[PDB]
Design a protein around this ligand. Structure first.
Ligand code: XNV
Length: 178
């Protein structure tokens, strides 16, 4: 698990800074990356401290117009991400997953969040959010955007918690299709 998590840290996971602070950003493919919606990125963000113009941005909502707490960004930079869409899996039920963080004080951080489960529709920051993956791990401030994953499987992006549970926005391959 650590070897797969380390591979994501070298080739896909970066630190993205908005006006709301530092967030772990996962590069999906080409110049497309994901970030929690509550980061509220503007026309420009910092990628590992470098000012990068945001070409495209759109918040993800399910077909039932329910918030997904995920925002897909297209960056105007030269480096193309490694295509990790093949690792995105929806078979997460009961998997002992790992959260890969690279933001704030948690740089190059690999956490064992225990077994995950599809919580579904929960009230996240007074906003109903669907496709919620829950793990019984005390995630902390500065870890939003961490990549929930296991060996050869990417499950979602951490979006919040309550000091005892943590929640990740489910990643699906259909999100990156026009
Ligand atoms: C990441 C954001 C951060 O670190 O600062 C940004 C620079 C945090 C991670 C949370 C904080 C506590 N433990 C975590 O894992 N995310 C949030 O703080 C989000 C922001 C949004 C949207 N947030 C804000 C307000 C409430 C909650 N949590 C819940 O509403 C909730 C519901 C249930 C059920 O359990 N928790 C929240 O995540």
């Amino acid at each position: 698990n650590t070897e797969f998590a380390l591979s994501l840290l070298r080739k896909n996971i970066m630190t993205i800074t908005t006006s709301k602070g530092e967030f772990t950003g996962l590069g999906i493919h080409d110049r497309v990356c994901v970030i929690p919606t509550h980061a509220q990125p503007g026309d420009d963000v910092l990628v590992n401290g470098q000012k990068i113009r945001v070409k495209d941005k759109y918040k993800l909502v399910d077909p039932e117009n329910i918030n997904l707490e995920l925002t897909v960004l297209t960056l105007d930079r030269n480096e193309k991400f490694r295509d990790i869409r093949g690792f995105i899996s929806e078979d997460l039920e009961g998997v002992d997953a790992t959260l890969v963080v690279h933001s704030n004080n948690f740089t190059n951080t690999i956490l064992e969040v225990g077994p995950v489960t599809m919580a579904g529709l929960i009230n996240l920051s007074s906003t109903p959010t669907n496709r919620m993956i829950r793990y019984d791990y005390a995630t902390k401030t500065g870890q939003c955007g961490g990549v929930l994953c296991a060996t050869g499987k990417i499950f979602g992006i951490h979006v919040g918690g309550n000091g005892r549970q943590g929640f990740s926005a489910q990643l699906k391959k259909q999100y990156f299709v026009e």
